[model samples]
Target: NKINLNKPIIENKNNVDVSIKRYNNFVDIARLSIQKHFEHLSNDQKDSHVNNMEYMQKFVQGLQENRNISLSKYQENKAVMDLKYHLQKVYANYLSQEE
Candidate 1:
């Protein structure tokens, strides 16, 4: 019962734009990239990868916690921006992988 690319851990849809919705979708995408190339990685790379995965999950939880506070449009925009940027980093790290 592992959470794979097709099976996500979070599924909230309260506010699609600023809620866990987008980030949840992001988790799956990153998971696929990691699955696609992870086992083939070297030891050092593997360690960093696990950290990144943890960091990825942590960010999702952070967003969830922050959501409790009254967020402004500016705050939402920043979060969205950070997620998009972090996503690109995931792709570069796990998608086909760059040296």
Candidate 2:
């Protein structure tokens, strides 16, 4: 099942806000989770993961700052979507291992 990011999802103002909030929350949790288990990964891996999390944080920030702007068609492509999916998987895996 693929989520078509380019297509209009039934998102109102409240939904958008909630989604952004969840994104922020997830980024925070993912960062903290990585930090707690940072030693398990190599230095390069740690740096890459941290950088990706930072990018995600900024991405959410950009969306918040630009209220009228919408996601680009490029964002809806498989590349961005795959990266997002991988990020979620990484976070979930780490969180489960943390528990």
Candidate 3:
């Protein structure tokens, strides 16, 4: 269920902003946290830092894979961002379920 990227499926400002914000929040937090962790690491801790970085990358890849499969029809420009919004929803639900 691949969507053609030549046209716009969602041409609304509100929806687009929502998607953008969600993607920004999720990725920004993950990225800044990674950056801070790296900044605090010592030269002697390089090996463990490398391992953690790799694991974080693989985690993001796993998220992308899951989102890609769940949103298979998302083949357009906005679709990628939309998947992030959906992931935000799922993550919230996950936290609630943990309670």
Strongest candidate by TM-score = 1
Ten-residue stretch with the least lDDT total in model 2: 1-10
lDDT of 1 by residue, 1-99 (tens): 122323343434344354466545544544454344555667567556544544444444444444443233443444444554655565566546545
CA-lDDT, candidates in order: 0.47, 0.43, 0.41
Deviation in angstroms for 78 in model 1?
1.6
Name the candidate, 1 or 2, with the larger TM-score value: 1
Q: Superpose all Cα atoms of candidate 2 onto the true structure and report the RMSD in Å to 1 decimal.
A: 12.0
What is the lDDT for 10 in model 3? 33
TM-score list, all predictions: 0.32, 0.27, 0.31
The TM-score-based order of candidates, best leading, equals: 1, 3, 2
Show model 3 residue runs off by greater than 4 Å.
Answer: 1-18, 44-53, 58-99
lDDT of 2 by residue, 36-65 (tens): 444466656654664364444343333433
Best-fitting candidate, measured by lDDT?
Answer: 1
In model 2, residue pairs whose N, Cα or C atoms come closer than 3 Å (at least 3 residues apart or on different chains), thus clashing, are: none
